[PDB]
């Protein structure tokens, strides 16, 4: 249960002098999705590779997902799962020519049992606080009883890139940003929505936070996005 953070905990986008379009890239209608798949191959101990061919463009036919530790990957190696996460190409390596390949972290959920019976999707409410006043709420939707934090994180930020220009090419409207999950069991964790200071953004590393393949009971988990501004 990581405790709500304070200013000297959080990233300031004004401390970022690189291209925020590189942050944006990862949450603007950008995600590897696949329904019912089994590992086909493997690179390091802690990874799993799938045949998930690029939906939109033609940028990849194989997807490597890196998990937190070996046994985590074995946990899923030979399981019929569901994939969904934010993918990256710079510094994505995996010697199995012709590349046609992408990488990501965690993002793996068991297939069978984990879907809501009929049509029906579950709606998860996201409260957004901007400088404290809760100025907008919304809902993201899924189809898995047990949905990765990743997955609802990505949808949340995608909606916000659009409805609040969470991300832009050059910068962001907000100085700080973080996204808190609070579970029924009383558990809570938050992720920094902003890139570390400096004139470079490592996409590989930022996403690595999804290593844990953390999952959350969609039906009851809550979501809080807290946004801060400075100059107004």
């Amino acid at each position: 249960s990581q405790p709500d953070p304070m200013p000297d905990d959080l990233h300031k986008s004004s401390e970022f002098t690189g291209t925020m379009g590189n942050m944006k890239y990862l949450y603007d209608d950008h995600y590897v999705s696949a329904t019912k798949v089994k590992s086909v191959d493997k690179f390091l101990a802690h990874d799993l590779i799938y045949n998930i061919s690029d939906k939109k463009l033609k940028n990849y036919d194989k997807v490597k997902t890196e998990l937190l530790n070996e046994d985590l990957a074995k946990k899923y190696k030979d399981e019929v799962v569901d994939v969904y996460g934010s993918n990256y190409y710079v510094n994505c390596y995996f010697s199995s020519t012709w590349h046609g390949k992408t990488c990501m972290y965690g993002g793996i959920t068991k297939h069978e049992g984990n879907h809501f019976d009929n049509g029906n999707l579950q709606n998860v409410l996201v409260r957004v606080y901007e400088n404290k006043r809760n100025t907008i709420s919304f809902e993201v939707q899924t189809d898995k009883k047990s949905v990765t934090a990743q997955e609802l994180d990505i949808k949340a930020r995608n909606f916000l890139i659009n409805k609040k220009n969470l991300y832009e090419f050059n910068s962001s409207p907000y100085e700080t940003g973080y996204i808190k999950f609070i579970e029924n069991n009383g558990n809570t964790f938050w992720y920094d929505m902003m890139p570390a200071p400096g004139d470079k953004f490592d996409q590989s590393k930022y996403l690595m936070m999804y290593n844990d393949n953390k999952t959350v009971d969609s039906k009851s988990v809550k979501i809080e996005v807290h946004l801060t501004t400075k100059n107004g």
Binding site: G18, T19, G21, N22, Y25, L26, L57, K58, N59, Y88, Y89, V90, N91, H99, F169, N170, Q203
Partner: protein
């Protein structure tokens, strides 16, 4: 045809969103967008190390960029301006070596 620029001639209006595509056939990781001006040799506006990546070069103001795929890297003028009226070159890079395209002249009325 190692680098292809399109359109090779464009005529835009002041304050109009303008996009100049670049295709490379070698699949190099890095791509660059410059603009040629007399006495200015060739200045770098934005470059990219991969699908997804995009980085400010020396004169990135007034322009955005976009790496949809390994082949396409494009430059974008959010709101074209007379000042942005120049001739534009993109390259694809292998290492210490560049491969340029035929070039693109733009007029912003």
């Amino acid at each position: 045809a190692a680098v292809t620029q399109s359109p090779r001639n464009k005529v835009a209006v002041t304050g109009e969103k303008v996009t100049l595509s670049c295709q490379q056939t070698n699949n190099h990781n890095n791509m660059y967008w410059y603009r040629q001006d007399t006495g200015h040799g060739l200045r770098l506006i934005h470059y990219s190390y991969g699908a997804g990546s995009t980085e400010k070069g020396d004169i990135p103001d007034g322009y955005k960029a976009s790496r949809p795929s390994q082949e396409q890297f494009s430059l974008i003028l959010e709101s074209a301006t007379p000042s942005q009226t120049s001739v534009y070159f993109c390259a694809s890079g292998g290492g210490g070596t560049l491969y340029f395209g035929a070039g693109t002249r733009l007029s912003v009325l």
